[PDB]
CSV table of C-alpha atoms and ligand atoms in Angstrom, one decimal:
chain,number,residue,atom,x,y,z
A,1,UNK,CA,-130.9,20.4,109.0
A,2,UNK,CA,-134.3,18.7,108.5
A,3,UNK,CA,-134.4,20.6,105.5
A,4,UNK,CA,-131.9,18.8,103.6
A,5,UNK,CA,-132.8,15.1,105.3
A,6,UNK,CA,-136.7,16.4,103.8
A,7,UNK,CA,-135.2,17.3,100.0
A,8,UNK,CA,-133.1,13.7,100.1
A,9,UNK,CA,-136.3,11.6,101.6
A,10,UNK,CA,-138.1,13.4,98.4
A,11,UNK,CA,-135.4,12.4,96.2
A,12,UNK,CA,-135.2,9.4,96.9
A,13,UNK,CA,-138.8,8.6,96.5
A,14,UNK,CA,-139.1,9.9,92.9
A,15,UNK,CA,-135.8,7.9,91.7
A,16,UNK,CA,-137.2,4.9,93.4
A,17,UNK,CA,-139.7,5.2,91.3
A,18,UNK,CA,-138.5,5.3,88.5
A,19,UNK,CA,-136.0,2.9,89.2
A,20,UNK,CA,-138.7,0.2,89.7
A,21,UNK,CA,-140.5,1.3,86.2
A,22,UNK,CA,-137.8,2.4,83.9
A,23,UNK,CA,-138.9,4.4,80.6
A,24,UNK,CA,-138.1,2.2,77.3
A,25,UNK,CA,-138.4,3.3,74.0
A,26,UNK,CA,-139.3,6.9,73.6
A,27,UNK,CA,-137.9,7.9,70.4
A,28,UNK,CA,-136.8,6.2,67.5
A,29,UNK,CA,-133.0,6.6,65.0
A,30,UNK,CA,-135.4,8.5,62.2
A,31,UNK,CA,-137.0,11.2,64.3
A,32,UNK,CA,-133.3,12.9,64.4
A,33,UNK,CA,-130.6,13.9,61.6
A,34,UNK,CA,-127.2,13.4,62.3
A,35,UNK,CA,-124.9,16.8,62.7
A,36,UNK,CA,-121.7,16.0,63.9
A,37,UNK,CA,-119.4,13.2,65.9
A,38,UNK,CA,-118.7,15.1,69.6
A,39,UNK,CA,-116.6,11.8,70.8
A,40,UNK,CA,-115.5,8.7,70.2
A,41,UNK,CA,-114.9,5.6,72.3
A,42,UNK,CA,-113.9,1.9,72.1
A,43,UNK,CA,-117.6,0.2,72.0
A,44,UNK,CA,-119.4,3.6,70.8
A,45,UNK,CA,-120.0,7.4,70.0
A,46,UNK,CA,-121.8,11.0,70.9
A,47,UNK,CA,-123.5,12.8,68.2
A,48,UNK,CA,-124.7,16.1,67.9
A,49,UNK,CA,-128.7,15.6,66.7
A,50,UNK,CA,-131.5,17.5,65.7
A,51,UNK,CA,-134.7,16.2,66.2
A,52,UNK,CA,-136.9,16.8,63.0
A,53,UNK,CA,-140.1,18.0,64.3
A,54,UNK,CA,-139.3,20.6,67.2
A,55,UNK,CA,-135.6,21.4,66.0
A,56,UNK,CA,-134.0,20.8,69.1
A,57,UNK,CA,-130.4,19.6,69.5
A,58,UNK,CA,-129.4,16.8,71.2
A,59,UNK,CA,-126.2,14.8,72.2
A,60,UNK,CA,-126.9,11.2,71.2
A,61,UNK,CA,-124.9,8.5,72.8
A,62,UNK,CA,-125.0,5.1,69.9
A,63,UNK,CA,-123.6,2.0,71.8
A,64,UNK,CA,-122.3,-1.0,69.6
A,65,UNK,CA,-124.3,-4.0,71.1
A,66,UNK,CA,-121.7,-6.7,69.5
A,67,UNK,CA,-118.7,-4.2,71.0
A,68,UNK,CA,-120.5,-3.6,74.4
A,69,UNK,CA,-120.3,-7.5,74.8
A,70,UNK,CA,-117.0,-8.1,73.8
A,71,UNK,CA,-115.5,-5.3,76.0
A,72,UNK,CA,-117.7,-6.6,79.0
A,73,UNK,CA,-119.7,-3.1,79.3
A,74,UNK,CA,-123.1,-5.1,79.6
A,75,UNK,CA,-124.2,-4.6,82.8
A,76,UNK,CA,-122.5,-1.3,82.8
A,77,UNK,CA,-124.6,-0.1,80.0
A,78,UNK,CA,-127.9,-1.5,81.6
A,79,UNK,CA,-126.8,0.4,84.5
A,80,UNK,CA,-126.4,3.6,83.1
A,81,UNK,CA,-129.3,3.9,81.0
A,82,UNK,CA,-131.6,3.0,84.1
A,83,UNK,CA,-130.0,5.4,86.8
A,84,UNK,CA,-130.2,8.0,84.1
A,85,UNK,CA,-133.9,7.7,83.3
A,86,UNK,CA,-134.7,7.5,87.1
A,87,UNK,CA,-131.7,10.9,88.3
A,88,UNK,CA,-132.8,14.4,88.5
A,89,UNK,CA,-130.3,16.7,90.1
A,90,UNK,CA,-129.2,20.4,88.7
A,91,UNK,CA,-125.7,19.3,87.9
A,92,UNK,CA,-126.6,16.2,85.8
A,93,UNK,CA,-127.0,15.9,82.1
A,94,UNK,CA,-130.3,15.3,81.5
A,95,UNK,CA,-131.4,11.9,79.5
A,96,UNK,CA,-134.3,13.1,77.4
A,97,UNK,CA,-134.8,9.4,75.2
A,98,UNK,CA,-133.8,6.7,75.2
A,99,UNK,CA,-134.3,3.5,72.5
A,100,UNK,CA,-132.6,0.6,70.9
A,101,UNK,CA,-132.3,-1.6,67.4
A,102,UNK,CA,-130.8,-4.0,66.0
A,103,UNK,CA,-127.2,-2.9,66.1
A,104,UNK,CA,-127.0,0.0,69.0
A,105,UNK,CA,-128.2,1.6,72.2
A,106,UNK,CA,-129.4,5.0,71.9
A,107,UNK,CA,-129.3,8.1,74.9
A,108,UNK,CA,-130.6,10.7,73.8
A,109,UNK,CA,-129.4,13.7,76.1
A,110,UNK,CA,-129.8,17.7,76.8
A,111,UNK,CA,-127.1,18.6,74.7
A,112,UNK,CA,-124.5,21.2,76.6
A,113,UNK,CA,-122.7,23.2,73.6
A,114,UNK,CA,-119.8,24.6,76.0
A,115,UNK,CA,-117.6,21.4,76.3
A,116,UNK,CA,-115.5,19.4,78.3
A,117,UNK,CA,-114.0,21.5,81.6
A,118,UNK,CA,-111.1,19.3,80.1
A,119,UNK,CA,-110.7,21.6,77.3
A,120,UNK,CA,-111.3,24.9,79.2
A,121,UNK,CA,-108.6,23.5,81.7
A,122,UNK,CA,-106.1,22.5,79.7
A,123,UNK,CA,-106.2,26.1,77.2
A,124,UNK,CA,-106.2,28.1,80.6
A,125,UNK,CA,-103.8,25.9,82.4
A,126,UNK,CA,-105.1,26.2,86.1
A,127,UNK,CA,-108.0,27.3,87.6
A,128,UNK,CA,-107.8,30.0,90.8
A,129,UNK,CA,-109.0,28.2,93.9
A,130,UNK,CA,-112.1,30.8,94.1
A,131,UNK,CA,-113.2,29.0,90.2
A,132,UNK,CA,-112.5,25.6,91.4
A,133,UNK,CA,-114.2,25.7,94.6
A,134,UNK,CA,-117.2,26.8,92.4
A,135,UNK,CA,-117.2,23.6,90.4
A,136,UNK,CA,-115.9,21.5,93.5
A,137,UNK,CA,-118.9,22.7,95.5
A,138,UNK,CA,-121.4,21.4,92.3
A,139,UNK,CA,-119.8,18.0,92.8
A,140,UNK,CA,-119.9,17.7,96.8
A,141,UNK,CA,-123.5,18.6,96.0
A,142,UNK,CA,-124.4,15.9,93.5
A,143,UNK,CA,-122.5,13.3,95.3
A,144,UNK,CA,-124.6,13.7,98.3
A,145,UNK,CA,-127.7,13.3,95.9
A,146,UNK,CA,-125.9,10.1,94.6
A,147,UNK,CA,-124.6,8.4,97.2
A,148,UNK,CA,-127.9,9.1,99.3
A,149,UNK,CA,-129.6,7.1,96.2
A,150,UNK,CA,-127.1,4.4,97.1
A,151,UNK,CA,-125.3,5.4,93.8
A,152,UNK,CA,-121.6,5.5,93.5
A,153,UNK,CA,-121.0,7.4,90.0
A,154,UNK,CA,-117.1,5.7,89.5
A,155,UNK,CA,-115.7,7.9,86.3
A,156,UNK,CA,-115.3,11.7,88.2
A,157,UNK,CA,-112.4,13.3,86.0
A,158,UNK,CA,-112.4,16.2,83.4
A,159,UNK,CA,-113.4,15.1,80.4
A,160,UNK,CA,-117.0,13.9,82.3
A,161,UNK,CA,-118.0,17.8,83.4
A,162,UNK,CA,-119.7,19.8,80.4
A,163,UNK,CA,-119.6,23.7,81.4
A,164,UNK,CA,-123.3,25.1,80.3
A,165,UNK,CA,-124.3,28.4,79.2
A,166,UNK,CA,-124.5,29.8,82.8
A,167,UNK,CA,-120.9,28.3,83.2
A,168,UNK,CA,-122.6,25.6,85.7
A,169,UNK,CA,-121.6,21.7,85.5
A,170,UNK,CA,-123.1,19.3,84.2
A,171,UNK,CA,-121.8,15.9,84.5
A,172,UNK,CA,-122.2,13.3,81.9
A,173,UNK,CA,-121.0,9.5,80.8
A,174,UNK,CA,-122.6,7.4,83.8
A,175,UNK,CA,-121.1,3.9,82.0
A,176,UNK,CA,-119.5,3.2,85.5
A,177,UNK,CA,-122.2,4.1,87.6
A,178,UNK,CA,-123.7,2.1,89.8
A,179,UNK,CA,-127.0,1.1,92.7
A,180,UNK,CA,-124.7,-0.2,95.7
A,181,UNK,CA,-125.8,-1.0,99.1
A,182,UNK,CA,-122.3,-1.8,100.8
A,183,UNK,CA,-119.5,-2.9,98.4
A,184,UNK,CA,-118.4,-3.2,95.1
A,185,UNK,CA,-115.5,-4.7,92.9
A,186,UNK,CA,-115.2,-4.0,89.4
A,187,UNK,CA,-111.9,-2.5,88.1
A,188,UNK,CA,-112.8,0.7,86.5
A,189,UNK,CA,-112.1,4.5,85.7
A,190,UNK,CA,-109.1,5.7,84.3
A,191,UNK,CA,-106.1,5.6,86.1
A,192,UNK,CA,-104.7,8.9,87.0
A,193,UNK,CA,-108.8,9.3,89.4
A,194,UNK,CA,-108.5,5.7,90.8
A,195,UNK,CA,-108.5,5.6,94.9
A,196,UNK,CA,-105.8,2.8,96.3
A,197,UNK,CA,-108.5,0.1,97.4
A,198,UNK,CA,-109.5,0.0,93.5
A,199,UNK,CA,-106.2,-0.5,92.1
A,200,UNK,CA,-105.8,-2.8,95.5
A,201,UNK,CA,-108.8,-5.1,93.9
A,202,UNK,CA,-110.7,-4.4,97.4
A,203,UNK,CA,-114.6,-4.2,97.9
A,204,UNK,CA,-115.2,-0.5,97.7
A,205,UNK,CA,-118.0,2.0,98.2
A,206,UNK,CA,-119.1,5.4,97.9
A,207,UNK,CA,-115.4,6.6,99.3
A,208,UNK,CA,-113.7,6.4,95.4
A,209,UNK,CA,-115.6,9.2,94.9
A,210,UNK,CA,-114.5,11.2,97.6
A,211,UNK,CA,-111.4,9.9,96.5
A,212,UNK,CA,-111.9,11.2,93.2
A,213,UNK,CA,-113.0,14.6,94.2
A,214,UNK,CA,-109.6,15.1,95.6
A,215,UNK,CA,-107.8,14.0,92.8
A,216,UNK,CA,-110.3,16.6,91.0
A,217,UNK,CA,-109.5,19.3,92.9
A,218,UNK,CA,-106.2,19.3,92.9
A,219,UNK,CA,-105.8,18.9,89.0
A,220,UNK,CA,-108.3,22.1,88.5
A,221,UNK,CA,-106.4,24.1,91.1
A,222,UNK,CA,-102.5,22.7,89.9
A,223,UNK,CA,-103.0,22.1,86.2
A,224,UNK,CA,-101.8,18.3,86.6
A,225,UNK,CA,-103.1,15.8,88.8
A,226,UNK,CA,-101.3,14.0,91.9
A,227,UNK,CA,-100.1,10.9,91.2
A,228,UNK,CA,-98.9,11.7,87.4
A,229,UNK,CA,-96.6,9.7,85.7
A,230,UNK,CA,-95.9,7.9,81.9
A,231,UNK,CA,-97.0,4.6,82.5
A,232,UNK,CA,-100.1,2.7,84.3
A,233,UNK,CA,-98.1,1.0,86.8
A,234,UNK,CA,-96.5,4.1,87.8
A,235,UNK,CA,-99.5,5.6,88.6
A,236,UNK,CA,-100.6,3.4,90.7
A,237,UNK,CA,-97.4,3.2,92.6
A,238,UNK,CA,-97.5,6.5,93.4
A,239,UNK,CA,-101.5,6.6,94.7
A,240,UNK,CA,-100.8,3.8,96.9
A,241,UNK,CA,-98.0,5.4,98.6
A,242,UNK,CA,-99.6,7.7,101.1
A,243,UNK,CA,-97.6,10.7,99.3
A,244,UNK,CA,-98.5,13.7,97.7
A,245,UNK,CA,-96.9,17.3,96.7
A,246,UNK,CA,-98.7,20.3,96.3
A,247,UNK,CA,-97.7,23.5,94.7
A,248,UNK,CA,-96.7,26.3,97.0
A,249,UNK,CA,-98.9,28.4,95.5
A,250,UNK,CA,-101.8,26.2,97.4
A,251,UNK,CA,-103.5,27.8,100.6
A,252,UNK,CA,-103.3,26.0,103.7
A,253,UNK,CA,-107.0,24.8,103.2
A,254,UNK,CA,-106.8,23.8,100.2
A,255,UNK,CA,-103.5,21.5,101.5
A,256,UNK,CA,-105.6,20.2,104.3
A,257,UNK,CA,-108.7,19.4,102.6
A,258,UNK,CA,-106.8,17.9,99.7
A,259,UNK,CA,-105.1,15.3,102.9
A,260,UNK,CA,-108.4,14.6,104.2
A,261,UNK,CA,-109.9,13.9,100.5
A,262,UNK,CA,-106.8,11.6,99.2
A,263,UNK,CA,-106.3,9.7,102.7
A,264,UNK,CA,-105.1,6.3,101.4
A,265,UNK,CA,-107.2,4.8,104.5
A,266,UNK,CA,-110.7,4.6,103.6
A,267,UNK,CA,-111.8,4.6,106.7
A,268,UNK,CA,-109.8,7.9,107.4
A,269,UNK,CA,-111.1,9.6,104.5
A,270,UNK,CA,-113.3,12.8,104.0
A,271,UNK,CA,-117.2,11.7,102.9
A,272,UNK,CA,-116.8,8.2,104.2
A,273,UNK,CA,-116.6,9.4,108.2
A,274,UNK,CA,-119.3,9.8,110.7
A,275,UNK,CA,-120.4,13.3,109.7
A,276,UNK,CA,-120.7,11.8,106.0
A,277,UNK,CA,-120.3,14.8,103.6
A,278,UNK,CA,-120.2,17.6,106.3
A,279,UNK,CA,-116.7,17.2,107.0
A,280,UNK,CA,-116.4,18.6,103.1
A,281,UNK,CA,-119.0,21.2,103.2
A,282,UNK,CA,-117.8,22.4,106.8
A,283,UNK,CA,-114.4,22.5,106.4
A,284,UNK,CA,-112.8,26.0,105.9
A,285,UNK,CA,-111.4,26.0,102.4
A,286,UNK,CA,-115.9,26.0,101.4
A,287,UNK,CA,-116.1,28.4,104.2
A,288,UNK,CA,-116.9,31.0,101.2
A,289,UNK,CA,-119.6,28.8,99.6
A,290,UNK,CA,-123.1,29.3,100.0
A,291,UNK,CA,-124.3,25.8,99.5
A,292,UNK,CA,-128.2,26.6,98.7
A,293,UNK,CA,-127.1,29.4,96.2
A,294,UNK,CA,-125.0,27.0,94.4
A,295,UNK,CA,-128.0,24.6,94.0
A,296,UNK,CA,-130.2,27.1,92.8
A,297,UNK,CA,-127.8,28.7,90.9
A,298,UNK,CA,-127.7,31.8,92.1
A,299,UNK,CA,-123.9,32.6,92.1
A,300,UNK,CA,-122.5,34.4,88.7
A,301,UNK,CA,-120.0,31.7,87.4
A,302,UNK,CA,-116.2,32.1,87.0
A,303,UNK,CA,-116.5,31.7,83.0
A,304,UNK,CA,-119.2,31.5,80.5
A,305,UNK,CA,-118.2,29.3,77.6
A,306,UNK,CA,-118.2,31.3,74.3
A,307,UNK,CA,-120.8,29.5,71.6
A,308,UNK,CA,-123.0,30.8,69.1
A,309,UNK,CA,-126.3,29.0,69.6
A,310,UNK,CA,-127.3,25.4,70.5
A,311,UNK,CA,-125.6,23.9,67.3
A,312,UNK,CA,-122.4,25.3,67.7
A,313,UNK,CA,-120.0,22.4,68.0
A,314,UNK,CA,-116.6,24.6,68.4
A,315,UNK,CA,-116.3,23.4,71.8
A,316,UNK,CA,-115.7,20.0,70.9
A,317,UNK,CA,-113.0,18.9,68.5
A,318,UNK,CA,-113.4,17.1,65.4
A,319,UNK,CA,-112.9,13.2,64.6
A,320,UNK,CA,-113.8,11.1,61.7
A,321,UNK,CA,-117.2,11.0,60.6
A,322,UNK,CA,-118.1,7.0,60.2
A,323,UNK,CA,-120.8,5.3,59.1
A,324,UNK,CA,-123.3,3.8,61.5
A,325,UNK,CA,-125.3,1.4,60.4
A,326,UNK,CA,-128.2,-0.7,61.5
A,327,UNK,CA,-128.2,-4.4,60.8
A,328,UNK,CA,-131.3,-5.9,58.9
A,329,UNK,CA,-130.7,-9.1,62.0
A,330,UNK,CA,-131.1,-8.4,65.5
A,331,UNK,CA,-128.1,-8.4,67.5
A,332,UNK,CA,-127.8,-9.1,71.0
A,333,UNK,CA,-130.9,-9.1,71.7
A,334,UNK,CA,-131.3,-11.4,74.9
A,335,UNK,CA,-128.9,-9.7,76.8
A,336,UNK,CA,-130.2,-5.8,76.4
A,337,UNK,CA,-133.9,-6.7,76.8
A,338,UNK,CA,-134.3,-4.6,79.5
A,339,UNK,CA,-132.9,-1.5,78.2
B,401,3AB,N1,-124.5,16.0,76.6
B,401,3AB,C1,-123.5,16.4,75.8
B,401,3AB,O1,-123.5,17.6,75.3
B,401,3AB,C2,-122.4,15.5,75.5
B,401,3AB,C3,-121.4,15.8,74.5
B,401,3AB,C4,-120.3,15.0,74.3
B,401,3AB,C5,-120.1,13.9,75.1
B,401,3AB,C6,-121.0,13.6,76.1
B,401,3AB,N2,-120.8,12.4,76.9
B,401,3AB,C7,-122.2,14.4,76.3
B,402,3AB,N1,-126.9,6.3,61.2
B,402,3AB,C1,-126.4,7.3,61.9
B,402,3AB,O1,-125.2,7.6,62.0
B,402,3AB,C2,-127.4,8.3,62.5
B,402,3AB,C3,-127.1,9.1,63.6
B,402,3AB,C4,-128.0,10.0,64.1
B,402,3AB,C5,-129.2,10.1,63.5
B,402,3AB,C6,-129.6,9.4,62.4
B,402,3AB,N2,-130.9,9.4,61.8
B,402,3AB,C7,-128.7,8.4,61.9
């Protein structure tokens, strides 16, 4: 309808925008005391903050310059920090600041105290098809604001959707995301997500999503994802093959959609045909979903995460808590000036 080819054309504009003029600098290491590690990685780390003038929480993502270069993240960091600061979709985790120093990148984002719909997965064990369409429909959503940006976001699994107080997603960690107009070939994303033309080394586009989505669903709905197995190689054995087993407790439409979604062809495959996402929002297993209420969330979620207030950590588990320093000589500093 001309009313969604409207809200896109607006979209677009305002990233555009932005995406020509990027914010820089907004905030600054000692406006914010430190709370609690929320996750680790190999190049950085997520903090729980508090900024020291309004008391508001944030989750603050420090990025090791020196470890960003070494593990070959550098335009992937440049990347995320600009689509962020540019995005604005219901289903995103907000970036609120962003700033650098010697040592580290800094993104500073809306902090979302219910966790990881990992966690929630993994204590319930599966999701009825009624809750996962419910978070499926949020991600057919904000991939159709994405890829009509000419983003492809690259890292869709678990761990990346934060449930928020009105049990809506939010989807954070956009390290793989990316401004494409045609193809792209990096190797990324974790293994068990990855469609066959990445692990193929092809040019790819927006379809890995799609791709992804499938893998998505079928992990909330079975408890386990598709192509499971111990090792890498394994894994990817089993995604190229053009086979896949579902529980018999699956509907019918859930079966077919979940075909359409993990079609090894690319050029057979759900969100990368003619119709472009329609043949997901049109096909029978959304037939339920009311697509605008969803966007304005207006539908009562499946489950509201249990917190106390906006510092409660108890959704997130606990790690280490390491120093982070700053270094008194400027690292990197040629190869991040843009951020
Ligand atoms: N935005 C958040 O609350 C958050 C928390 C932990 C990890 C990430 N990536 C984000
Ligand atoms: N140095 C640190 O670990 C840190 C993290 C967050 C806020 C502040 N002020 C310091």
């Amino acid at each position: 309808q001309e009313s969604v080819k409207e809200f896109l054309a607006k979209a677009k504009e305002e990233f555009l925008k932005k995406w020509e003029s990027p914010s820089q600098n907004t905030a600054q290491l000692d406006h914010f005391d430190r709370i609690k590690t929320l996750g680790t990685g190999s190049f950085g780390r997520v903090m729980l903050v508090k900024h020291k003038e309004t008391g508001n929480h944030y989750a603050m993502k420090i990025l090791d310059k020196q470890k960003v270069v070494k593990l070959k993240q550098i335009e992937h960091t440049l990347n995320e920090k600009r689509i962020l600061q540019a995005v604005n979709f219901p289903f995103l985790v907000k970036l609120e600041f962003s700033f650098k120093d010697n040592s580290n990148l800094y993104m500073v984002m809306e902090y979302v105290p219910g966790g990881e719909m990992f966690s929630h997965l993994r204590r319930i064990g599966r999701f009825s098809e009624p809750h996962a369409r419910f978070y499926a429909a949020q991600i057919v959503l904000t991939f159709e604001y994405l890829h009509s940006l000419d983003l492809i976001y690259r890292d869709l699994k678990p761990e990346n959707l934060l449930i928020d107080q009105q049990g809506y997603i939010q989807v954070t960690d956009f390290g793989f995301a990316k401004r494409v107009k045609g193809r792209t070939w990096t190797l990324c994303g974790t293994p068990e997500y990855l469609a066959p033309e990445i692990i193929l080394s092809k040019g790819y586009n927006k379809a890995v999503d799609w791709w992804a989505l499938g893998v998505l669903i079928y992990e909330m709905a079975a408890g386990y994802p598709p192509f499971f197995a111990d090792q890498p190689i394994q894994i990817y054995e089993k995604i190229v093959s053009g086979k896949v087993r579902f529980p018999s407790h699956f509907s019918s439409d859930l079966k077919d959609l979940l075909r359409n979604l993990l079609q090894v062809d690319l050029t057979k495959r759900f969100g990368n045909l003619k119709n472009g996402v329609n043949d997901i929002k049109n096909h029978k297993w959304f037939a339920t979903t009311d697509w605008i209420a969803i966007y304005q969330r207006k539908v009562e979620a499946p489950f509201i995460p249990k917190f106390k207030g906006p510092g409660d950590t108890s959704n997130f588990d606990d790690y280490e808590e390491e120093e982070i320093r700053v270094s008194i000589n400027e690292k990197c500093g040629k190869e991040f000036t843009e951020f």
